[PDB]
Structure formats: structure tokens, C-alpha cells
Design a protein around this ligand. Sequence first.
Ligand SMILES: [K+]
Ligand SMILES: [Mg+2]
Ligand SMILES: [Mg+2]
Ligand SMILES: [Mg+2]
Ligand SMILES: [Mg+2]
Ligand SMILES: [Mg+2]
Ligand SMILES: [Mg+2]
Ligand SMILES: [Mg+2]
Ligand SMILES: [Mg+2]
Ligand SMILES: [Mg+2]
Ligand SMILES: [Mg+2]
Ligand SMILES: [Mg+2]
Ligand SMILES: [Mg+2]
Ligand SMILES: [Mg+2]
Ligand SMILES: [Mg+2]
Lengths: 191, 172, 197, 136
Amino acid sequence: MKYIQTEQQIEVPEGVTVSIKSRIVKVVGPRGTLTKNLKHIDVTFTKVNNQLIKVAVHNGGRKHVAALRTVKSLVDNMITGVTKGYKYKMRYVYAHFPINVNIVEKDGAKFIEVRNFLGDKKIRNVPVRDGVTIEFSTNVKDEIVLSGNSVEDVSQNAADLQQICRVRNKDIRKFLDGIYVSHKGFITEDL
Amino acid sequence: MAHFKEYQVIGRRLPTESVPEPKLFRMRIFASNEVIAKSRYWYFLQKLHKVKKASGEIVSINQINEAHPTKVKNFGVWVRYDSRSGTHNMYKEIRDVSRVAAVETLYQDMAARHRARFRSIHILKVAEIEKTADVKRQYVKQFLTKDLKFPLPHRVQKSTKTFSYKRPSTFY
Amino acid sequence: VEPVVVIDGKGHLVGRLASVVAKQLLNGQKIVVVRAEELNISGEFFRNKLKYHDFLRKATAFNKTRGPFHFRAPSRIFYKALRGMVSHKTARGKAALERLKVFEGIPPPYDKKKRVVVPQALRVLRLKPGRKYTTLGKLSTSVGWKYEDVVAKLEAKRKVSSAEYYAKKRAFTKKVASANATAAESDVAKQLAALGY
Amino acid sequence: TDSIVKASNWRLVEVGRVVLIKKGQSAGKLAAIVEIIDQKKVLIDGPKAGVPRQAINLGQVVLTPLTFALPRGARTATVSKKWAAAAVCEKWAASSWAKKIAQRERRAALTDFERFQVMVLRKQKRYTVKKALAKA
RNA sequence: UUUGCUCCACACAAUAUAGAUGGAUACGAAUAAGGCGUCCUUGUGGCGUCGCUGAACCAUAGCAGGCUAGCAACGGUGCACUUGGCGGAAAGGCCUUGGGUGCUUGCUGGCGAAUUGCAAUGUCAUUUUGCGUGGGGAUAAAUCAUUUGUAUACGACUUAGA
RNA sequence: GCAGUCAAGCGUUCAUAGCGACAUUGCUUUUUGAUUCUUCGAUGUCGGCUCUUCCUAUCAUACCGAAGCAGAAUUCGGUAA
RNA sequence: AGAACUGGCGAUGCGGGAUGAACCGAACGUAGAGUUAAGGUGCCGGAAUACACGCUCAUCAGACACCACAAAAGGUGUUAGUUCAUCUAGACAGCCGGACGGUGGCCAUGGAAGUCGGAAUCCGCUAAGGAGUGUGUAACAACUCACCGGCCGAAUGAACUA
RNA sequence: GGCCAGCAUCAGUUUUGGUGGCAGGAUAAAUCCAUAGGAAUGUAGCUUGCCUCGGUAAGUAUUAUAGCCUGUG
Ligand SMILES: [K+]
Ligand SMILES: [Mg+2]
Ligand SMILES: [Mg+2]
Ligand SMILES: [Mg+2]
Ligand SMILES: [Mg+2]
Ligand SMILES: [Mg+2]
Ligand SMILES: [Mg+2]
Ligand SMILES: [Mg+2]
Ligand SMILES: [Mg+2]
Ligand SMILES: [Mg+2]
Ligand SMILES: [Mg+2]
Ligand SMILES: [Mg+2]
Ligand SMILES: [Mg+2]
Ligand SMILES: [Mg+2]
Ligand SMILES: [Mg+2]
């Protein structure tokens, strides 16, 4: 249909500064600085009042306007990650063999090490992406917590941990063992 | 067929001893020239009434010029066209300054979107939508908003020379 | 309009650039193409990789050394396009092809010479925005070109040197512009402006 | 501490936008967008320069940075009046763009004797400028 | 080497020309963005300005560009010297110091041009080679034959021999 | 010969895990025909042996999805020569 | 493989369909100039990287008749339409709150508690509430949905066509 | 006299520009002018509501401190 103009609003809270040169977005907040290259989308950013950015697509087709809202969501996630942070809680699930998850170092590289998954003698190692913090939750049995500014990095680190523990050659409806994301929220409570 | 003109064509169904002064049927035909206009008149008249060019006569043919060719109008266009597997009526809307321009746009659009050639299309009606909010197509409605402005991003300048020494810009 | 035209191949839509260049050589113009690794091809990198693999499987069955030769370097890919658009089996086509040089990066003969572009072959002017395109250097590396890193390193070095040259030139140009801005209200300058200069 | 977003200001297809006709019967005259037909088509009117009121493809004109207040659909007399009040011709002639067009037309109009005089004057100005550049 | 070889300079003979006829005139990156100028609190900063093509810029007057006389200014430019630096991707080029010499159309004079007859590319470029005149430089190998067998149909290979 | 579509039914209940009637759309040229265009001043007529290469409609091996996949075994399917 | 009519090839070059007896165009003495046919005009290749409105992104894209193949059936890919509906008297989505009394209704089911269940989908209060929409439990207790509200703000749903 | 050309004025064929006078149509339609009537993507004005300059929102209001549409001449 080639809609004349489509636009989305990105709300900027008080303690956040958004610097957008051509299509490289830098978001600065209390928790840190995030950066995203969006030169692949052909959108136009415009600051309105220092609390509102508008992102627009002119003469855009269906896919172009579909990507506009994706741009808005990505910038919103950047802002949410520098203000509230992102935290993913994963639970270990096993029928018989306890899963042994720890943090080890290889040349100072901070791997999540998984042993005894379904009795395996193989040691699985999932690197920790920079910016992601791993904390093992006390008062909850078999819970690993991944926290960070970038939802992309924390969710991909959690997904790597989940994927490393896929069951092979078994009915997965029965052999349900693995490390599964049980919660995805923010670092700051009740916000 | 070409850049269109609109003609009124009036034909007669030639008088006989029993029926002098026959009924003088008129049509509005979009065609590139008067020959095609009269051919189209006989085509549609043969579709409608018991007559043909051999048993009838063209009483008049007159180009109808747009009354206000320099005012932008919204047109509702009812067409009937043959697809590859059937016949369909469709209603479309075209923004243009004249009926002939709207009909040229319509033929282009039918050929582009439904691969319907001129021979497969009947223009049932072209009418100015006098009142906005009777425009019922979004691709026309979006141009009827107040204070409509829009940029033209990524301007491409046509070079008159093979080689440029500047690494051009698409600013506008 | 020059004895040699040096085309900076960066972002230049290999087929359209090849068409322009082939016509230029056949018309008798000497062409030097630089930065062939930064040429573009419309379509996804995976598409163009698949096309090159279709090219790769073609070979003389009884002796592969007779078959079509699959050159991996970006300059030779561009050369293949040009040769396919030149009548290369005739003496005229041979002469046209000797009127051509293609390089990865900008080697020392041409790094201090003016580079031109071809607007009718430029990707940013030709391709619809949002259309995916391939970079010749990436494609060439994927199909077995060995010198992407060396070319990139030498290009970074050349860019440092060329930026220093341009800083000096910009300073001198500002000086000349100031000296022309002064004596712009002179009688000679007013007469020149009256005549259009 | 303030958000910075580069504005990237475009020339807008809008009623009152001044355009320069680049090809056609007008070919170098100023006209005003009277209203917008489609994404690619506008109704323009150039009554001061002699551009007839017409629907034109946006690819046949180049938008100028000049705009003036004009109501949508304004007729030719109204366009003329508002154009005169906004003094569009003076604003356009003051721009480097129109000055460049005029300079290229003047250079095209130079005779051979005038070109010789241009050479002599350029040599004189060059002597002065090179001396100044060596001094500084 | 019945004076051989090489380099440079000059002259003379050839030899051709995928095709000179003012100058290939150097940022990088982006293009839903940039260039330049300027300012500061030096940034993804503010302000100003430009584009809308090189239709530019530079160069360009003088018997294919002669011979002369001045003015003005210490500029521009050619040459051969020369100071130092940078350049290895195919550098073989780029920049810079100093003096010398010529030209200078920045400006103002004096003389010359004709008859190539009303046009005729009306010969102005550079590619190789040879020769002669000077200057400078250096003073071997390879193959056959013989020999080895790490080789081998023959060639080839791989060894040895003042 | 191989592969689709529909889905009445089978599959304890459940059309489609796996199948699938009545119909119907195709593909292939490893079947056999049909034809008689080439060859009757001659293209050496079975099979095997030997050897190379190609195809994929994959038997195995690699990695996977599905199941009427608890395990084991197996079946259906994908990328794959 | 066999007939009808015509036009062809055979017997025929020429321009076009890359190529080809038959197709398209056009039939032919030797030349010059002009204009065209069919077919083309990015480059090969003579001729607009012409103008204009749309459509299409293909991890097997498509690209001019004869002709050198592809079908049924499918796809919230994307485009344009047909018809029927909902909707500022607030449409669909999401979130939040409730979602009854009689009544754990009767019948029974081993155990059913609005819901393994069987008939009626009972009345009242109703904005709404179905003897319930489903789940859960041996049953329960309990949830959950339809449903109704709050927010939200203008579009939405379905079946079809190509 | 032979060979090869240059220009001018013509003739035959043709190609490519500049410019003049007419004819027709709805004696183009338009624009423009005048007039009558309208509504809106509602201009001025006016009322209600905000408050960061002072502007904005909702109504009313058919030319006013913009205009436009239609008919007629
Ligand atoms: K035979
Ligand atoms: Mg198993
Ligand atoms: Mg190799
Ligand atoms: Mg036969
Ligand atoms: Mg024989
Ligand atoms: Mg034989
Ligand atoms: Mg044989
Ligand atoms: Mg397969
Ligand atoms: Mg015969
Ligand atoms: Mg024939
Ligand atoms: Mg063919
Ligand atoms: Mg002839
Ligand atoms: Mg050509
Ligand atoms: Mg189909
Ligand atoms: Mg004549």
C-alpha cells in the first residue's frame, strides 16, 4: 500500500540520555551504556522534547513498517536495560542425575560449566557473554540467574545454556532434563 | 491503448419505414482516438441492444473535456474485467485532476496488478467522490489528511556523464 | 576525457560497472579499476555464494585443467564479468582488454591519482533501499580468495597516509580560499564576476 | 545529559513548497505546490514565471528550500498574490543555487573576445592572489 | 674475441605506433546522510554555509610563440644543481632547503611575420634497434664430450673432473 | 516405475503416528510397447570380467525433526551422493 | 499414422527467431542515397542504463509466439479486489477485577462439588454468569474461560476471488 | 588534355531545424472577471480548558484578519 508516514514513540525516562547519530544509537543510563547499529532498516529518528524520540518510515511498505516497530522495541529494550536491567532465571530439571552447574575460568574467560547432565561424563562449557553476570540463587533450589543491561546478551546466554543441555536419542517428552528459562524480568524489583 | 480521451458517442439504430426517428443511444467512451471510440461504442451497444454497425449509424461523436482540469479530484471507478478464470467487478479509487488521467491510471493499475489487458476491461462508471469520508480506500484516504507533508528521502540524481568525480549524495 | 580513468570500484554493482567499462575499453579508453574487493552484487550473500558454487561445479570432465577457470579474487571476478561482455576472442577484444587493469585495494601507482565513480553503476543510486546486496571481498573469501586480510591491512595503511595528505591539502585549500576571498572586491574581481567568473 | 538526535531535515512535499522545473516546456522556472495528488504527483502552479497550472510528476521537478504560506488548492490568482507577498523570486535569486544557474548561463553566453578578456583578468587576479599567498 | 661487453651524452640512420594533440586534478566514511568554515563545555556538540554535478578547477595571449626597451613586485614558472625527509602493494614516486640561470602576458612601449598564394595532419609525440664520436665501468659461464646412479625408454635428472 | 492432492475408513476412542478406499494431478525414461527419423558401399548383437565417472528416487555412515519415541529395537520424514 | 482448404518448404537466397528446410518479415540483375518490415536498442551488438504507472526478492527468481514443457493442491509472503459482519451507544488484542443466590441443582456415576457424566440449558440478581467453558482433584477444596466490567483508543473479524 | 580536391550557383532525391498565416471543437475545456449558492481537510472571530514562552485542544462560526467547491453569465 506504501503508507505515506508511519511513526512510533520512544519514551525516554529522566536519567537516560539517547544519542542517535546517523543510525548508531547510544543509550546511557544509571546501569551503563548500550549501543546498537540500525543502519540496516532505513528509519528516521527525531528528538521531540528530551523525553520523547520519534522514529518514522516515509513511503514505507508492509515489511518496512513492520521493521519500524521492531526498531522502537529495540530502543525501548536498550532503555529498559540501562534503567531496570534484565534478569533471566533458569531452573535445572532432572529426573535422576543432579545437574552440577558452576562458574569456572579458562584463561579468565568465565565459562558456565555443566557436569553430570543425565549422567554424562562430558563436561559442557557455555561462555559468559560480556556484560552478563551469573549468580546462583540461594533460597531457590537449582536456579541460575543471568543479569545484564542488554536483553539480547542475557537471553542469548540463557539460550546457550538451555541449548547445551538438549537430550539426544531419547523421548524428550519423558527425558525432560535440562536447564530451562523459567522467568524473564528486570533486575529492579516492583518497577 | 494510449493516452486516453473521453468521447460522447451517440448512435441511432438506423430509421426504417415503421420506426422513423429511432431512440438515439449515447455512451461515454474512453479511447485514444475517434476510430477506437466508435468501435468501442458499437461493441458495448451490441452487448446491450439488438443493433450493429451495419444496422445502425453514428449520429455524433464529441470529445468531452474535463470541466475543471486543474483541480484535484478523488474518483470512484467501477470496472468489470475478465481474469484468466472468470469475470469480476471491482471498485477502485484514483486521485487525479481529470477523468482521462484517472482512466489511464486505472488501465495501468489493472494491467499491473491483475494482468488485465485493455480488451478484458469494461469501465462501468467513473464518478467524482464529492464528499471526502465517502472515499473508502486507504491508499487514497491517506492523501486527504490535513496539512499533508512528506519528504522524498534518497534522491537519485541522473548524471549526464559516464564518470563523476564527487561520490554523489542522496540528500533532499 | 583523460588518458587513463581510474574507477574506485567500491560499491559499484559489478554488472553495471562491467558494462560501462567494457564499452569504455571498446571505445578506446584506458581504464584502471581499484578496490575490486569493495564491489557490490545485488542479492543476498548466500544467493551469490550459491551462484558461484554453480559456477564452480562447471569443469571439463576429462581434464579439469581444460575447463572453465574459477578465479576467486574480486578483481578476477569483475574481470570475468567484463570479459563476458567483451568479444575477447578477437584481436579487437584483446586490445580492449589490454586497455584494462583491475586491482584489489589501490596499489602505489594509483593511490596518488584521482579516482572517479560511475553513477549509473553506483549501488546507492541504483538499488532500491532495503534490497540486500553482497560485497565482493566477502564472497571471494568464502570461495577461496586468500588475501582479504592483507588487502585490508594495506588499505588501512594507505588510508592513514591519504588522510594525512588530505589534511595538508585542506589546510592549503583554506589558505587559498582566504586569499581569494580577499581581493574579491577588487576591480579585476568585479569585472570577472560580470563576465561570470 | 541531553538526548542528541541528528535532525536530517528534508525538503517536504507540501502546499506552498517552491519547486524548480528541470525538464519540459518550463525547464528552469519556479512553481508552487498547490496540492498533492499521489506520492509521485502534485498539482503545481507557476503563474509569475509563466508555468501553467498542471499536474506534474514529482520526478520532473526538484524541491527548493523555499516555502510560502499557501492554502491547499489555491487558484492561480491566489497563488500569484501569495507568491508576490512572500517575494519568492527575490528569495530564490538570493540563493547560491540560482546564482550558480545564472553564472553558468552567463559563461555560456560569453563570446570569444569575452573569453579572452576573462583569461587576461584571471591572469591579473592570479598575480595578485599568488603574491598574497606567498606573503602570507 | 681477427677489438669483444655494459652504462651515460651527442649525432646520424632505421623501426614502428589498438592511436598524445593544455592537465589521469589523490581523504575516508555515510547516503533515512554528508562536505567545508567557525566556536566551545572537544562531542554521535552548537552555529553558519554548500550541493540540486566536472556546465568545475587549474591552465590558457607572444615567429608551434621571435628580437628588443621599460614599469611594478620579490610573486609565478622552467632547467640543471642542492638540503633533508617520507614512500615496498607493483615502492621507482611524493614532499622539502638553499643558491644559480632563463622566462614571465601583472602593466606599458619599438621591431618582425606576407608569396604555405582561398584549404590540404601540412609533419612539433614516443617505441625499439643499429651505427659513429667521447666519457665511465666489469674482466664469466653454459652446453657437448668424459663421469656418477640417489636418475633413467630416449631426452631429462643427479654427481665428479684443471 | 516413482511421487502428489482429497479423505470414506483402519489405527481400542482418534481421518491424516503410521496407513488409507472411491476418485484425481503428475513426474521418470533403469520396463515393455508404439513409431520408423538416422544407419543395410556394415556404428561388431548376450552376459561376465576390468575400470572411471556421473545421478539420487539414501541401504549404510554424519547431523537432525516425528511417533501409537519409557528403555532397547523400530518406523515416518529432513539436509545430505 | 490418415484426410479437407489454403499458404509454404522441396525448388529459396535475404533481415529476424542465438542455432534450425517449413515460423515471423520479406522473396533476390549491378550499385548509390533515403525509409522501413519482423525483431530489437545495459555490454557482447547497430540502436534511449529512455520516459511513465504499478507488481515481484525466489537457500531451484524471471526474462517473449512456433520453441525447446510442468499440473492438481497449497502459503497472515505480498498486492489488489468480492461479499458478509463487529465498531466511539468503545470494534478485535493485551492487562486487571470479578464470573453469582436458589444450587454441591435433579438423576445418578465407586467417587461429580456449575463441567467423566445423562435430560433442561430453570428462575431470580442481573453489567455478567452458561445447571455452566474447560482444567484440576477419587471426589474435593479450588481455579479457569465463555460472559461482564475497567483501561485502551479506531479500526477489526470471517469467507472468498486472482 | 590526366589525377585529387575546395567554394559558389542550380537540378533530382532525401534528412534535420527556425519561423509566419489560417481552420475546427462546448466557435476547445481551463485560467481570469462577475454573480448566485454551498461545506470543510473550517480562515478570521467568539466561548469553554490548560499552562513553559504564549501557544494548543473541543465547540460554534460559512469569509471575516486565508481560502476553496458548484452552478450561471
Ligand atoms: K544397417
Ligand atoms: Mg530409543
Ligand atoms: Mg585451490
Ligand atoms: Mg511416415
Ligand atoms: Mg562407410
Ligand atoms: Mg567398422
Ligand atoms: Mg566403433
Ligand atoms: Mg533427496
Ligand atoms: Mg526432390
Ligand atoms: Mg522462403
Ligand atoms: Mg530460439
Ligand atoms: Mg538496392
Ligand atoms: Mg551500441
Ligand atoms: Mg495455483
Ligand atoms: Mg538542393
